[PDB]
Every structure is written in structure tokens, then in C-alpha cells.
Design an enzyme around this catalytic site. Sequence first.
Site, PDB file in Angstrom:
ATOM      1  CG  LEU A  21      -1.871  -1.194   1.322  1.00 41.22           C
ATOM      2  CD1 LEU A  21      -2.732  -1.200   2.834  1.00 41.22           C
ATOM      3  CD2 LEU A  21      -2.666  -1.366   0.115  1.00 41.22           C
ATOM      4  CG  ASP A  22       0.252   4.498  -2.861  1.00 39.73           C
ATOM      5  OD1 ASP A  22      -0.791   3.956  -2.500  1.00 39.73           O
ATOM      6  OD2 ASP A  22       0.225   5.380  -3.935  1.00 39.73           O
ATOM      7  CB  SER A  23       1.299   7.945   0.587  1.00 39.97           C
ATOM      8  OG  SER A  23       2.631   7.949   0.204  1.00 39.97           O
ATOM      9  CG  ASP A  81      -3.650   2.519  -2.689  1.00 37.59           C
ATOM     10  OD1 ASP A  81      -4.754   2.785  -2.964  1.00 37.59           O
ATOM     11  OD2 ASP A  81      -2.720   2.232  -3.277  1.00 37.59           O
TER      12      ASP A  81
END
Lengths: 69, 105, 45, 77, 88, 132, 491, 53, 64, 54, 257
Positions: E43-45, E47
Site C-alpha cells: 500500500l502506497d501513501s 491507499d
Amino acid sequence: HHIHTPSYIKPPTGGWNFTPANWKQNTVLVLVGFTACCVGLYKLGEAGSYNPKLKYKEEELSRWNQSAK
Amino acid sequence: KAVVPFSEANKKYVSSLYRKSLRTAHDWINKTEFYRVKASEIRSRFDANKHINDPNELKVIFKETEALLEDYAHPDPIIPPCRPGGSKFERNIPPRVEARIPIDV
Amino acid sequence: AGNPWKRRDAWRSQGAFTRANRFRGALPGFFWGLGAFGVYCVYEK
Amino acid sequence: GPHLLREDASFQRYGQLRDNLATYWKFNRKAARNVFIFLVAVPAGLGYLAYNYEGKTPFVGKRRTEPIFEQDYVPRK
Amino acid sequence: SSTPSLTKEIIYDRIVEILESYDNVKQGSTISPAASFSKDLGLDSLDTVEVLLELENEFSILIPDNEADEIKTVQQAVDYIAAQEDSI
Amino acid sequence: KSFLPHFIPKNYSYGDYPRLKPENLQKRDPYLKYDDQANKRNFNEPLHPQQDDLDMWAPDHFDFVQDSIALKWFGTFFGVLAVFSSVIYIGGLYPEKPANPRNYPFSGLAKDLGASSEEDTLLYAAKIDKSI
Amino acid sequence: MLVQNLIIFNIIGIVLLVLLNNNNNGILNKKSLLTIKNELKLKQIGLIISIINILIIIENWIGFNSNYYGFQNIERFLNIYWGIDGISLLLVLLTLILGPIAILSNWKNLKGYYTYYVISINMLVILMALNFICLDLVSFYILFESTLAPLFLLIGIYGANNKNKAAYYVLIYTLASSLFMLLSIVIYYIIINSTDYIYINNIILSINLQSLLFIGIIIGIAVKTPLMPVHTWLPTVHSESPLGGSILLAGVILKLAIYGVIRLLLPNLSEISMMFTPIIYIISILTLIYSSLITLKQTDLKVIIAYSSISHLAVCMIGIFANNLIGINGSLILCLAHGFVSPALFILVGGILYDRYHNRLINYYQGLSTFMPIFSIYLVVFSFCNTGTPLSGNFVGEFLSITGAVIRHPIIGSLTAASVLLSACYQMKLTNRLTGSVFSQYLHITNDVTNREIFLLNWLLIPTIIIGIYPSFVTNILNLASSTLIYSVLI
Amino acid sequence: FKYVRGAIVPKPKVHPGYVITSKFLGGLMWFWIFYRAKQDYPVWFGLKHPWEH
Amino acid sequence: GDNYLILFVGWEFIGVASYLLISFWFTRFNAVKSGLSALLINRFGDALLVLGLSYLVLVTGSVN
Amino acid sequence: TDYLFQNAANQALYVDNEADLKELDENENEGWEKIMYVGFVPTMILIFAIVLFK
Amino acid sequence: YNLALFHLICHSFFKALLFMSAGSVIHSIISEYQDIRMYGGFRQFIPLAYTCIFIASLSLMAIPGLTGFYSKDIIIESMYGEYTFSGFIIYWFALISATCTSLYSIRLIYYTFLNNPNSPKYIYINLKENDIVLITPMIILTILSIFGGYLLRDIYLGMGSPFNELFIHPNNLSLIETEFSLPSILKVLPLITGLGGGLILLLIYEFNYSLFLVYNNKNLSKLYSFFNQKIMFDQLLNNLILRSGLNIGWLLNVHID
Ligand SMILES: CCCCCCCCCCCC(=O)OC[C@H](COP(=O)(O)OCC[N+](C)(C)C)OC(=O)CCCCCCCCCCC
Ligand SMILES: CCCCCCCCCCCC(=O)OC[C@H](COP(=O)(O)OCC[N+](C)(C)C)OC(=O)CCCCCCCCCCC
Ligand SMILES: CCCCCCCCCCCC(=O)OC[C@H](COP(=O)(O)OCC[N+](C)(C)C)OC(=O)CCCCCCCCCCC
Ligand SMILES: CCCCCCCCCCCC(=O)OC[C@H](COP(=O)(O)OCC[N+](C)(C)C)OC(=O)CCCCCCCCCCC
């Protein structure tokens, strides 16, 4: 559940869910006293109440008006 | 303070804007299926500017974003009842636990 | 991604929350009132 | 005895300032305008009204001597 | 009756359902209490922010920005939800 | 966004009293932790000279729109109802009375309405039924 | 059988306390037994003296005739004539009642010298009580200003941090103004050769001289009620004087100005009182309105109570200057009711909160109902009494004073109705803050209202409710006396 | 209590007393609405006068 | 009540009881300030109500 | 008679004890209860009786 | 005065029912939410509370046959029956008020009971009706909200009924011109705007909710904000009237005292 500091905080209305151990004994002492006051109010109310539309006949009112003229 | 792209401070600042964007959308849109379209549209408007390197350019967008949030702000935002600003906030707060200090009044 | 929450929002429009089931009873006892009124008419003839 | 109140320095300075606002008051043009309004202009308005209607309001048992409702109706047609 | 309390067993059963229903979660990515977000789940920022917004909506709370940045794994979310009197 | 309430001075000189920017404590972040959480204040934090106008016990301040814009809308709303009312009056579009207003016998019920004689008949009577 | 017994008994009482306490002062380095327990046996004797003073006026009350016009119990003492009528009788009873209450308020909250304090309190109560039963202007002025000497020392010795400033304010404000009243009294003794109440009431002076006499007398009265703009001394004195001094000042001293209007202005300067009535209303209305708004910005707990007394006495001045019986009776009723509620507010603020935390700033107190429920009950009840809520004597006094004002002047007298709103604005804002929100973070949990403080609050609350529900106890005595003060020629 | 992941909420099965009481209360209203309509629909709309019969 | 003053007694205690009911949860800041708002606005009407009763005594000499 | 007839030798012994005994330590037995409930409260009753039955 | 008293008695019964049932919905939901935007699909889970709301809403909307119809519909008619300029203007204001009365009742019901669920699924699996003690007053009020107005109409609204306590001057009796002279259209106009207008709102919400996404249009956003902030009266009262009244005390304290 929580802390209510009930050892010294004793308001007339209980202080955070208060019910004494002898709550049944006091409830009967209150119900009898409460019943003894409704009856007393009823007797006082009946003996003191009156009908303001029947304390004087209409013939009496006619004499009052004629004299006031 | 100057804006540092791709830093830890910028990630919190950008994520703060993203939460305000979606929470504002939740206030206006009362249906989940209509809210998802707007929520995905906001992200599509966020990822588009993810590849920006100049801090000077990034400052304008932050200024622009903080104006859309203020313009689109709902006058009656949704607040959880027990959270600050809620209906049950500060309701029946338990009394402070502390022993009494007697005084010879 | 288009609606990354499709599998989470499915329950909100299925089973009890379908369009048919939500409104099935929006008028409480409408047909029951019709029956009593219909029975009342026969009792008054 | 036990100093039951946790004294706060900021509160004490705030309290001391409120009790000693007279020390720093200056009779400038702003102060003069407020003094004139509250002590001269406002009393003069009450002063005029009090004597304008002094002994000119016989409201005790005041009688009606003018009909309230209209007798005849005039249609707009 | 009211809610049958809220233990970490029931809290974990609800956060996991959020991650399973999130398509942006990386393929595989076994969901465990020790699992993280950026590394284990992919998960990125942005998400992760959406996960937290669903997390606060699921329990009907509001998570401040300072507290949100300190939640990076699954166990931390379970403990964070547990340490709140208004989690329902 | 937020703005200070009215009558909050920009400057003051009360001797050696500290001079700090006026802050409305109602607008502070509630998710922070304070020594006085209810009032959103930490211990020994300095107070503005008019802090009583900028705290929780002060009247709640509304900062969604400016007061001039809020008063422009308020006048506009009642301005619409004023024009709507005047047009119908000047235009005279309101309906006419379908019938003559109600009449009453016995000189318009004069005696029953506190009249004494014929001198005070018009002072107390209702609309007189002229058609017996 | 009244003034002679009251003065002689109290003088003997003063001598008795002086002999006992000062017997071993001769560098004996002694311990003695009278000084044990903070001079308990000397406080007790002084408390008994105050109680007996009440019984002295009760014996004369039994023989009082409410259907008799003129002064009763006429007595010659110290070459001075003393008498009692309906108005004087009730004010004397209020003054003597506050005697034990003032002493009981400072029972165990003084740093020392209880005997000096007890003698000073009893001396003040008697001197103020004697001021209601004197029958000439000279005797009125003597007792009007004799209280300054015991009060100046009392504030300067037992006062708060700013006691020095407060002592100068009360001594100089109340003397420089009373001297202007002495000038009018001197004029009476020059042109009439007498200052007797009955003698000067029948004399009509020139309209210019009545104007000069009214101004001289009203300056002494207006400072003492007090009225704006000569009121600034009162908040300073209350915020620094001891609790017993505040009770006497708020409960008795401020009522001497209203009684002064009854004796020195209405029956002797009747023609000029009618002319001055619009001016008095304008000053009193502004005093009422301004004081209420000024109270909204105060931060000292005891100062807020001090300003509340100014607004209420403005209504009393408005009512007493109305030329009808409704306004006059209402002003007298409000004075009696204020004589009980106002000391109670000082007791709650300066006697209960101050004796525990020793700080009068408002920022330190909030949510006191959490650990002090008994305190909050009395605070809320007395707050509603102070705001003129019905079932309290204040409402009866305020409503009749407002009604009498409207009868006297329908246009500007209607502004007195603003006291209903303005009084609730500052009084409830204080009470709402003291009881609302969470318990203060700056306070430690301690004892609630003790038995001694319960007694003070209950026996100040009881007279207020009795007068509020059945004011005919007061009206019957006042009706014949108050009807003499009306000046009108209806033809 | 156990929470079942990914299970749609079926039709609730409330206590029979609540369902029967709710329908009867609605049935009382609807019947009374129709009963008054059968006897007062002319007068309601002004199409007839109450004395006319 | 058979006169306006007895009406005023109930009129005032209606605001008093409502003030104690709106601010029943006195630990909540909003409830405390809301109860004060109801009381002070109602006291504004009470001030006019007193003025109306005073004029009633002025004109008719009674409130019955 | 202890407050007036006792000599210096006997009086000093009581006071030294009283300070030390008090030091070895709610809001009761303050010395006002008997005075007020025998002198003041009945006096108020008499005032109540006068306004009622005179 | 007879019309006002009768509507006052009837309103006390079905409006109390609305508050009781509204508080029953807040207790039924575990989170105790009070915003209707977080509600949805409660109709099946709490049918007894819904019926009390539904019956009270129809009584409030002056649906014919109910208590509100016999008490409220006559007052709206009396405005036109006055046949004066003020009465005609107030008739439109009352007519719009009647139309809105049905509009926000349908809107409130749809958001709370008929809308798609907004609260978490965990709320619906713990959503249950309350106990009998809470229900008992609501049922008693519900019956009084159906039959009460019909039984008491003749006491207060009957022609010639003796109510000497309420005095009506002979020149002010318009109960005849209100009852007979009214056009037949005005007798049903509030009903048409109520039910018909409510159906239009219901259809838009269910199938064309994209219209009500008012955050797009700028004029709609201002119009929504203006009425959501209650005609800005609260802001005007506090920021202008109360603040200035406090500043007058500050000016008096600083410059005078
Ligand atoms: C015609 C007028 C008749 C009035 C008689 C009515 C019965 C009186 C009941 C008193 C006991 C009570 O309720 O006050 C005391 C209760 C006690 O709190 P608790 O609920 O026991 O919980 C305890 C939990 N604490 C400790 C956190 C509160 O609250 C309070 O401290 C509220 C403070 C203000 C009290 C206002 C009293 C009523 C004022 C009336 C103005 C005329
Ligand atoms: C069936 C019969 C029906 C009628 C019942 C009548 C009950 C009478 C009351 C008995 C209990 C009692 O007097 O309570 C007294 C209470 C309880 O606190 P306390 O006693 O001081 O204890 C605490 C102290 N401690 C800890 C030392 C023991 O004191 C109060 O603070 C009362 C304050 C007054 C509140 C009411 C004011 C009303 C003003 C307006 C009036 C119209
Ligand atoms: C009604 C007419 C009364 C007039 C006479 C009154 C008594 C005068 C004093 C003589 C005895 C004395 O000075 O004794 C002193 C007494 C006792 O105090 P203490 O604490 O025991 O003294 C301290 C010794 N220690 C510490 C060892 C215990 O205190 C007083 O000063 C009280 C009376 C005076 C109060 C007012 C003073 C100013 C008066 C101005 C008049 C216009
Ligand atoms: C006609 C109605 C008259 C009403 C009374 C008149 C004003 C009274 C002022 C109180 C003074 C006071 O208390 O004297 C004490 C004050 C102390 O001042 P402080 O408070 O410590 O601050 C000031 C000190 N600093 C700056 C260090 C903080 O010294 C003075 O001022 C001395 C002069 C007083 C002379 C009063 C004569 C009055 C003449 C008669 C009227 C023309």
C-alpha cells in the site's frame, strides 16, 4: 464500572446511580406518606373549592347594576 | 518553511489534504455508490500530480488545494457522536479520581 | 482503479437492502386496511 | 492550610491587569468620545424624554371614545 | 440489547474484512496481525489513507492526522481501536 | 477561513503586560491534549487582556461566511418577500370579499356590546344589519 | 425602654469583653483560658450579646400599633428624642438579625484579635440600628457617620491584600459626601432653630432654598446607596473588607440611603422632590443599566456580587421616589429582601470558596457541582432569588417598584423593566459558569459546605421566601407609615 | 458472538410482536382514512354540503 | 392561575426548569451554554411581560 | 469558674496540653451550635409567631 | 382563537410521538448517531418505530381523516377566508409551509428508513427494537394521533359552541366565509402539493440522486448553506448583537468605571 467517590459525595438526589440497601423499607414509608398527602389535598380541595358562576343569582346582579347607575 | 517533495513531512501534509478531500465528499454525498465515484475522482486528481519535482510548482497546488477545501467545505459536517463536536461529546464524563483533602473550615 | 471498494459495498444493495425489500412494507398495513374496509362494506349491505 | 488552589502565573497577571486598568487609561480622543456618549449624550436623550412627557400621560383608567371597527364596507370593484 | 462489548477478537475480524475487500491490496499478501501496510500488503501513501478512512468509518470514530501516521501495521490498528471508549 | 470576532483590538499597551496575538481558543484543535482539556488551554499559558471574549465561555463565534456576506443574504431573503408582498398589494391581485361582511340585528348588537343609549350606539355596535 | 436598654446593655457588653481579655496584657507572658480555641469563650459572649439585642426590639414590637399614625415608643435619652413607626420598625429588625449572622460568618477564618472584631461588629450593628430610631436631623447625621470609625479600622485590620486602599475609599467617599449633607442640616437649624422630624415636615421653604437643600442631602445619599457616578468606592470595599464587614455594608449600610430619602427629603422637601424626580429616575436608570453591563466584564468573584447590589438599589431608589404607595412599598420590600440575599451571595463567594482556595479570580472555578453539590444548590437558588424570580422577596420588591415607577412616569419609568433581563444576564452567567463544564483543573477536592455555613445560608434563605410568598407580613406594618410620604393635590 | 466476513445481511427476523403491532397500527390508520373518505369525501372537497343527503 | 401574576409565577419557573433540563448534562460544554441561551432569551420576554403587567395595573388597577 | 478563679499555676498547665493535644491530630463542635439553636432559632420562631398570631 | 386552541391540543399529541420515536431510533442504533445521513434501511429492522413515525408524519401532513387534518387544514383555509391583503399573503406562506411540511417528512423518512444503508454492517446485525416500557407511550399517542381530532372537533370548531373564555368579536367571525365561500380547488391544493410534491421528491432521491449533489452548482451551494445555517440568524445574533452588548460593558468598564 467506574469510580464516583461516593464516600463523601452524598447529594439529595443520589450521586451516580445510588440505591440504599434498605430501599424497600424507605419506599413503603414514602408511599404511605405520599398517599397521606394526596388524600389531605383532596379533602382541602373539596372543602375550599367553589363555583364562581353560582355565588350570586342573576336577580342580585340586576340590583347591583341598578344601584351602581 | 520550504516544501520538500518526496519527504516524510510532505507525505503527512499531502495525506492531511487527502483526508479533508474525502471527508468533505462524504458530507455532501449521502449515498455510498455516488460517494465512491467522487472518492475515486479525487484520487485520480491526486495521483496525476504525484510526479512533480519542483517545490515552487508544488507550493501553488497546495495553495490551490487548500482553497477548494475551504470552498467545498460542508456547513454541517458529519461528526461521530462521542468525538469532539459530536452529540454525545463530554456527556456523563466520569468524575476525577482523587482523594479528598480535608480542611478545618 | 475504478471503485476499489466494489467487494465491500456489495452488501449495501443485496439481501435485505435490495430496492424491492427496502420498500416492501413502506405502507404498514395498507392491504390489511383495505381488507377491513372491504369487509366493512359487505357488513353494511 | 494545604493550598488547595494551584495558582497560575498567567491567571494572576491577567487578574492583576483587570484590577489595575485605571493605571494605563489615557484621556485621548477615543476615550473622550466614549465618555461623551455614556455620560452626556445618553443622559441628555433620557433627560429630554423624561421632561417632555412629564405630567402629560394620564393613563389611569383611560377611556375609549372612538369606534374601532368600520361600519360600511366599500368594495374595490 | 447494546453491542456485546468489543474485544480484540471481534475487532480483528472486522479490520481483516476491510483488507480482503480492498482490490488495491497486493496479490497474495497474507493478512496477519504482524503484517504491515507498505511492505506486507503493498500500500502506497494514498491507499493507506483510504484504508484508515474505512477503518474510522467501520468503528464510527475519527482518527486525527497525528495518530493516523502512527498506525502502519495491522496489530497497531487493532490496539488503537481497542484503546478507545467510543469504538462501536 | 477563521477570523477574529469584532471589537478585538489589534494593539494594546498596558505597561509591561506581555503583548500576544489575540487568539480565539474556541477555534483550537480539540484532538490535541491540554492541561485544561475542556477550555483547550495549557498551564501557565499567557492570556490576552480580553481573553474572556476569546475563550469557550464567550459567545460561540460563527466563521462559515463573513458577517457582511451573511447580512447580505439575510437582507436578500426578506427583500424577496417584501417585493412579493408589495407587488400583490399595488397590483391589487388579492381576491375581493365574496359577500357583504356579517351583519347583526338590534342596531348591530349595540346594547349587547356595552352601549348605553343612542349616543354611544356607533361607539360599541358591530356592523349594523340595515335590512332589519 | 428601647434606646436606653439597647445602649446600656451593649456598653456593658463592650466593657465585659474588654475587662476579660485585657486583664492579663501586662507583659505577663501568660497563656490563660479565655484565649483557648481562638478565644472561643470571648466570641461566644459577643454572639450572645447580638442575640439579646434582637430580643430588645421584639419586646417593643409586641406593643407596636399598626393602626396608629405617628411615631410610637417616644423616648427621651441623652437629650435626644427617639421614636418608632412602621418603616423604622422593620429596618431595625433587619439590622439586628444580621448581627449574629455577621459574627458567625467569621467564626474561625480570622488570623486573630477576635475580641476586637466581635466588639466592632456589635458596635456597628447598634449604631446603624439607632440611626433608624432617631427623631432629628442632627441625631441622624451623628449615627450616620459614627459608623465610619469602627468600619475604617475593621477593614484596615481584617482586610484582604488591598485593605489599605479600601479603608481610604470608604472613609473619604462617605465623609466628603456626608459633609455636604451636614451643610443642609446646618441650614435647617439656622432658619428654623430645630432639626426635629415633625417640626421640619410642616415648614415650606422657598423653591430656590429647597433646591439647595435637596442637592446637599442627595449628595450624601447618592454616594451611600450608591448611585452612578459616585459608586466606584463600593466594589473596592467589598472586594477587600472581611466577610462580616461585607454583610453589614451590603445588608444595612446601603439601606440607610433609602431610609434617608424617607426622613430627610420626602416629608420636608416635598415640593422639590417632585421636581427632582425625573432627574433621579434618569440617574438611577443609567445606574441600573450601566452596572449590569459593567458586571459582565468583571473577573473578581466578590466584585461581581458588589456590582449586583448597585443595580438592585437603583430599583430601590426608583421605587422610593415614586409618588404612589405601590412604588414606596415595593422599594421597602426590596430593601428587606436584598438585606438577606446579598449577604448570602457574599457568603457563598467570599466565605465558602475564598475560605478554601483563597483566590477570588473567576478563571479558577468551574464545574463545582461535581464535588460540591450542597454549595451548588444554594448558589443556584440564591442566584434565582437575586434575579427577581417569583416566590422570593426580591420579585415582590422589584415588581412593585417597577409598577410604581410606571405609575409615576409611564414613559421613562418603563425602562426599569430592563432589570428583569439585565440582572439575569450577569448573575446567571456567573452561576452557569460556576456549575457547568467539568470540575476545575486548578482546584483540589475538599470539604463541601459545613454545618456552620449551612446554617448561615438557610436562615438567610428563609426570610426571603416568607416575604416572597406572603409579603403581607411586611405590607401591613408599612401601609400606614408609607401613606404619609405621598404628596399630591387632586381636585 | 462471532463476526462472519463477507456475509450480506439477510432479511431481519424481528420478534413477532413488533411486526403484528406495527401492521395493526397501520391497519387502524388506513381503515380510518378510508372510512372517513367513504363518508366525507364530498364535504372535504366542497363538492357537496353536509346537510345535503 | 386566575390572574396574570399567578401566570407569571409559572411563566418564570417554566424557564427555570427548562434551564435545568437543557443543561442536565452539565459536564458537556454545549449543553451548559445552550441552557443559558434558552434562559436569557426567555428572560427577555419576561422583562416585557413584567412591563405589560405594570401597565395593566396602571390602566385598570388589577391583574385579575 | 475555671476561666476566672483559677490561679496562674493551674491555668498554664491546661493551655500547654491543649496546643500539644490539638497538634496530635470534622468541622463540628465549634462552640456556636448551642447558642444559635437556643437563642437565635427560638427568637426567629417568636418573630414568626408575631407576624402570624398578633 | 378556537382554531388555535384545537390545533394546539392536536399538535401536542403527534409531535410528542415524533420526538419519542426519533429517540427510539437513536437508542436502537448502537452508535447512537443522530445524523440522518448516517442512517438508511431501518424500515425492516425497526418496523414498530417506523410505523409510529409514519403515522405521526401523516397526521402532521394533515392527511384527511387524521387529527392534524381536522386541526391544521382549517387554519390554512381561514387565511384565504379572511379575504384581506394580509390573509391572502399569509395563505401562500402557510401553503408553502404545508408543502414543506410534507417535503421534509418524506425526506426525513427516506434518509432514516428507505435510503441505502450508510452505517456499518455491524450496526444492522445489532439493530433491534426497544423494550415495552418505551413502546407503551408511543402506542397510546399513536391512537390519539388517529382518532383524537375527529372526536374533539365539535367541541372547539363547532359553530355556536359556547367557549366564552375565548372572546371573538362579532365583526371578526369568519367561520362562515371560510367554510362555504372557498373555491373547491383551495380545499385540495395543500393535499396536491403535499402528496404530489412528496412523490416527486421521493422519485428524485431514489433514481436521480445526482441532482441533489449540490456541491457542484455554486448558487445551489450558497442556497443550501444559507438555509442550513438557519437564515444566518444565529451568526447575526452572536457576532453582532451579543458581541456588541458585551463590548458596551467593556467600554463602560474601561472608559467610565
Ligand atoms: C418550585 C421549586 C421547587 C424546587 C424543588 C425541587 C427539588 C430540589 C432538588 C435539589 C437536589 C438536586 O437535584 O440538586 C443537587 C444535584 C446532585 O446531583 P445528582 O443528580 O444527585 O448527581 C450527583 C452528581 N454530581 C455530583 C456530579 C452533580 O444536582 C446538582 O448538584 C445540580 C446543581 C444545581 C442544583 C439546582 C437545584 C434546583 C434549583 C431550584 C431553583 C428554584
Ligand atoms: C411525601 C412528602 C412530600 C414532600 C417532601 C418534602 C421534603 C422536604 C425536604 C427534606 C430534605 C431536606 O431538608 O434536605 C436538606 C438538604 C440536603 O442536604 P443537607 O440536609 O444539608 O445534607 C448535607 C449536609 N451534610 C453532609 C453535613 C449532612 O439541604 C439542602 O442543601 C437544601 C437546600 C434547599 C433546597 C430547596 C430550596 C427551595 C427554595 C424555594 C422553595 C419554594
Ligand atoms: C457605644 C460606645 C462605645 C465606645 C467605647 C468602646 C470601647 C473603646 C475601647 C476601649 C477598650 C480598648 O481599647 O480595649 C481594646 C479592645 C479589646 O480588644 P482585644 O483583642 O482584647 O485587644 C487586644 C489585646 N490582646 C491582643 C492581648 C487580646 O478592642 C477595642 O478597642 C474594641 C473597641 C473599639 C472599636 C472602635 C475603635 C474606634 C472608636 C472610635 C469612636 C468614634
Ligand atoms: C461629592 C462626592 C464626593 C465623593 C468622594 C470624593 C472623591 C474621594 C476620593 C478618595 C481618595 C482616597 O481614597 O484617598 C486615598 C488616595 C490613595 O489613592 P490609591 O487608591 O491608593 O491610588 C493612588 C496611589 N497610587 C498612584 C500610588 C497607586 O489618595 C488620594 O487620592 C489623596 C487625595 C484625596 C483627596 C480627596 C478630597 C476630596 C474633596 C471633596 C470632593 C471635591
